[PDB]
Amino acid sequence: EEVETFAFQAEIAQLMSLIINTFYSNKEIFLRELISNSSDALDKIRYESLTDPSKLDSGKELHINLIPNKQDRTLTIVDTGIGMTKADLINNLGTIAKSGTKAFMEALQAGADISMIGQFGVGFYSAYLVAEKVTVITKHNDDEQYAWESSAGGSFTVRTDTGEPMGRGTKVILHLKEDQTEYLEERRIKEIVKKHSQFIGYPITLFVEK
Numbered sequence: 001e002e003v004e005t006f007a008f009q010a011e012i013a014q015l016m017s018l019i020i021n022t023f024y025s026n027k028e029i030f031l032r033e034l035i036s037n038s039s040d041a042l043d044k045i046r047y048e049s050l051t052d053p054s055k056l057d058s059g060k061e062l063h064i065n066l067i068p069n070k071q072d073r074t075l076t077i078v079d080t081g082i083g084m085t086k087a088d089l090i091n092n093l094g095t096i097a098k099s100g101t102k103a104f105m106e107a108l109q110a111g112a113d114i115s116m117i118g119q120f121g122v123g124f125y126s127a128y129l130v131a132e133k134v135t136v137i138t139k140h141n142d143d144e145q146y147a148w149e150s151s152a153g154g155s156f157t158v159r160t161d162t163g164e165p166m167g168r169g170t171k172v173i174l175h176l177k178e179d180q181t182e183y184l185e186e187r188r189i190k191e192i193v194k195k196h197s198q199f200i201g202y203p204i205t206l207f208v209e210k
């Protein structure tokens with residue numbers, strides 16, 4: 001029931017402020033970037049399992065689920081990948097985000113655009129193109145289940161998660177901005193997945209709603 005609050009490193013705070021406040025119409029790349037992250041996490045537990053099959057005792061299925069919820073105005077990306085320890089979460093969700101931001105902003109001045117964010121290892125933060133808040137629920141074999149959350153503004157929280165047990169993996173819950181609800185529509189998500197993620201090597205299931 002204890003919540004810890006952390007400050008973002010200055011460079012990540014600046015990155016998030018850039019993504020939040022730059023005029024950039026091609027916001028759909030956020031989903032490509034989150035699906036790519038999930039794919040990398042699934043590769044990692046698969047790789048670990050090749051020499052230690054017990055790594056899959058927490059779940060043998062390796063997949064990515066996309067879950068829109070119009071009532072909550074949320075779009076959730078679920079994977080059964082390696083997941084993240086508490087230390088991984090605090091360390092910028094397993095990324096080298098300080099140095100990657102630096103490389104990304106230097107690329108932006110030399111004629112790169114925001115869609116190239118994933119080449120600098122910080123594509124997670126493109127979530128803020130379309131979300132006002134992001135909640136990440138995660139479970140790694142070596143640690144307990146945790147919830148990370150941030151509405152930008154310079155800080156994030158970490159707490160033990162009491163929700164439904166996940167087994168192993170990561171859920172990225174996007175609390176969408178009011179003018180970005182097109183990403184809850186079935187036909188729009190399908191369009192984006194077919195365009196940017198057609199060759200991902202894991203089944204991607206787009207859930208539907210009542």
Ligand SMILES: Nc1ncnc2[nH]cnc12
Binds near residue numbers: 037038041081083170
């Ligand atoms: N889906 C994911 N799995 C593991 N680490 C991550 N860091 C960011 N997204 C992640």
